[PDB]
Structures are given as structure tokens and as C-alpha cells.
Design an enzyme around this catalytic site. Sequence first.
Site, mmCIF file in Angstrom:
data_model
loop_
_atom_site.group_PDB
_atom_site.id
_atom_site.type_symbol
_atom_site.label_atom_id
_atom_site.label_comp_id
_atom_site.label_asym_id
_atom_site.label_seq_id
_atom_site.Cartn_x
_atom_site.Cartn_y
_atom_site.Cartn_z
ATOM 1 N N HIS A 61 -60.982 3.132 22.629
ATOM 2 C CA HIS A 61 -61.715 2.831 23.625
ATOM 3 C C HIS A 61 -61.156 1.329 24.399
ATOM 4 C CE1 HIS A 61 -64.852 5.679 22.426
ATOM 5 N NE2 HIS A 61 -64.856 4.945 21.484
ATOM 6 N N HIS A 91 -62.404 -8.347 23.849
ATOM 7 C CA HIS A 91 -61.649 -7.228 24.236
ATOM 8 C C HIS A 91 -61.744 -7.202 25.691
ATOM 9 C CE1 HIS A 91 -66.056 -6.133 24.121
ATOM 10 N NE2 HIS A 91 -65.701 -5.379 25.144
ATOM 11 N N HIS A 93 -61.789 -4.724 29.451
ATOM 12 C CA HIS A 93 -61.927 -3.504 30.033
ATOM 13 C C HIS A 93 -61.041 -3.583 31.637
ATOM 14 C CE1 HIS A 93 -65.543 -2.601 28.058
ATOM 15 N NE2 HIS A 93 -65.555 -3.741 27.943
ATOM 16 N N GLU A 103 -66.149 -4.525 34.838
ATOM 17 C CA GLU A 103 -67.655 -3.770 34.422
ATOM 18 C C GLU A 103 -68.497 -4.440 35.598
ATOM 19 O OE1 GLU A 103 -67.999 -3.395 30.265
ATOM 20 O OE2 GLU A 103 -67.467 -1.350 30.644
ATOM 21 N N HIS A 116 -64.458 -9.627 27.620
ATOM 22 C CA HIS A 116 -65.614 -9.961 27.099
ATOM 23 C C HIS A 116 -65.515 -10.529 25.697
ATOM 24 C CE1 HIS A 116 -67.541 -6.279 29.176
ATOM 25 N NE2 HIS A 116 -67.523 -7.330 30.046
ATOM 26 N N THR A 195 -72.330 -2.425 27.064
ATOM 27 C CA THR A 195 -71.862 -1.595 27.986
ATOM 28 C C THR A 195 -71.107 -0.347 27.357
ATOM 29 O OG1 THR A 195 -69.712 -2.623 28.387
ATOM 30 C CG2 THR A 195 -71.505 -3.641 29.609
ATOM 31 N N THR A 196 -71.019 -0.335 26.021
ATOM 32 C CA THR A 196 -70.733 1.051 25.584
ATOM 33 C C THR A 196 -71.728 1.470 24.427
ATOM 34 O OG1 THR A 196 -69.580 -0.277 23.589
ATOM 35 C CG2 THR A 196 -67.935 0.302 25.434
HETATM 36 C C1 LIG Z 1 -68.482 -6.318 16.959
HETATM 37 C C2 LIG Z 1 -68.612 -4.918 17.659
HETATM 38 C C3 LIG Z 1 -68.808 -5.303 19.198
HETATM 39 O O1 LIG Z 1 -68.519 -6.287 19.658
HETATM 40 N N1 LIG Z 1 -69.418 -3.966 19.905
HETATM 41 C C4 LIG Z 1 -69.289 -4.122 21.254
HETATM 42 N N2 LIG Z 1 -69.684 -2.950 22.088
HETATM 43 N N3 LIG Z 1 -69.807 -3.082 23.545
HETATM 44 C C5 LIG Z 1 -69.556 -4.556 23.676
HETATM 45 S S1 LIG Z 1 -69.497 -4.961 25.260
HETATM 46 N N4 LIG Z 1 -68.492 -4.100 26.135
HETATM 47 O O2 LIG Z 1 -70.878 -5.046 25.860
HETATM 48 O O3 LIG Z 1 -69.047 -6.688 25.185
HETATM 49 S S2 LIG Z 1 -69.335 -5.205 22.478
HETATM 50 ZN ZN LIG Z 2 -66.861 -4.923 26.856
#
Ligand SMILES: CCC(=O)Nc1nnc(S(N)(=O)=O)s1
Ligand SMILES: [Zn+2]
Length: 257
Positions: A61, A91, A93, A103, A116, A195-196
Site C-alpha cells: 500500500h 511513509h 501517500h 490525504e 506521515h 487513514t488506512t
Molecule cells: C506501525 C503501523 C502504522 O503506522 N500503521 C498506520 N496505518 N495508517 C497510518 S496513517 N496513514 O494514518 O498515518 S499509520
Molecule cells: Zn499515512
Amino acid sequence: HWGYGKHNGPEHWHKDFPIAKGERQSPVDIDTHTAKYDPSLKPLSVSYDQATSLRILNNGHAFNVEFDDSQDKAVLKGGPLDGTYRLIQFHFHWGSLDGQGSEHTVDKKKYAAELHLVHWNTKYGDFGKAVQQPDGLAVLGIFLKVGSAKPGLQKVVDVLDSIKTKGKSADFTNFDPRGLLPESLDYWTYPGSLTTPPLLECVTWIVLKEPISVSSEQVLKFRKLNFNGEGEPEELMVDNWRPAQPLKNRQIKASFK
Ligand SMILES: CCC(=O)Nc1nnc(S(N)(=O)=O)s1
Ligand SMILES: [Zn+2]
């Protein structure tokens, strides 16, 4: 399984994750004229000097740059936060085109990408317990626009060829995430969610007002990644962003006048 495609994208997530229609979902549009300056908000404290990156992973993803979060090495404090939140990974997007990818939006404006930096509240001991708490996570969101290159991003860009497909990882030590920040730490903040999937409502969002600039070449390399695994038909990893969700009974606060 969930993703960003025609048949498994954000509009489908609620069927497996009903909280997708919850009361504090993310991302949201930041209406800059409706966000209220909060003089009680404190400056963000970003303490990344001892950050220990370990690995970069294509999870199908996005790609995650992972950090050693077994000690208070890279921490976020202050701002709207109570206590200490430890960096676990970052990471991005991004879009298939420069006109979309972020996002969060700012007065409906979409940026080319969004970074993020994910932190968990150390009072809950581990990330898995933190996501079960309303104040479990603090995600620092940073917008990316296309212009001049970001020198500190290049080490990330150049490893992506080695993690092109889902499930691939690479050693990624000694990366300094301070090289991904903008000059100013002015921010908006609101209570939201991952957001996932599983879309848990555990995040204090801190979204920086100043975007970072990255070059067209840098973002094009993001777009060469694959959602698919090796030996599968190529599906370019692009448009891995969830659109803005209803603000509902929430106020976005600004750290700046
Ligand atoms: C450590 C695992 C992790 O960070 N999982 C997340 N899943 N969605 C995220 S977001 N896009 O809200 O920052 S982070
Ligand atoms: Zn994110």
C-alpha cells in the site's frame, strides 16, 4: 483485500471496517479560515537527533521507513500532546499526477503527496496497545509539492528500486528524518484516525502548514513502485490516498495567527 483500486478502494472499506463511517475519521479538509488559533497550543518538540532507522518495506500500500522504537530515541512532544510519543515509522501517500496525492487538503487544495511520521504514546507501552486508545498515536503530516528537490529525501528515493514490489524490504540504517521537515513547525491539529484500515480512531493529527518541496524526478520514482508482488502483473503504486472525510463534531486548531 482492501486497497486503492476500483473495487477495493476507500469507498468499499466500510464493509469490512464499519468505523470508516465513524465520528473522527481522517483525513479531512482543513478550512484555513474556520480553524481557530489556539494561543494555549505549545510549539511542537521534534527530537529526532538519536533516531535509529532500520529498514524500508514495500507493504503493498505504501513504503514504510521503520525505526527502532525500543527506546526514547526519536520522540514528538509538546504541541497539543500530553506526554511522549515515539517515532515508529514514516511513509507517504502520493498521486498518479502532481495535482493529487495528499490525504489532507487545505481549502480543498490537494498536494502532490503527504508524508506521515507515525508516533505512539509511550504510556501505552507498544504500538499495538496504543492504537486501542483515543490518544494512542500522534501522526505528523507534511505536505509535498513539486518544485526543487528535497536533498534529504534522495536516500529514500534511491533505495526504491530495491523494494519495487509488495513484501520486499531493504536495510535502511542511518537515515535522518530531520531532512524531511520544512523550516517552520506551524501546524493545524485535530482528533482523527488512521487513514488506512483498520481506520482506528486513535490519532492526534498534527499537520504542518509549510509544505516541503520535492522534485518531479523524486516523485516520479515513487510512482514506479508496485502494489503487486514480484511475478504478478504490474500495478503502479499511485493514488494510495484516502479522500477527505466528514469533519462532523470536530474543531481544527491552529498553532499560529
Ligand atoms: C506501525 C503501523 C502504522 O503506522 N500503521 C498506520 N496505518 N495508517 C497510518 S496513517 N496513514 O494514518 O498515518 S499509520
Ligand atoms: Zn499515512
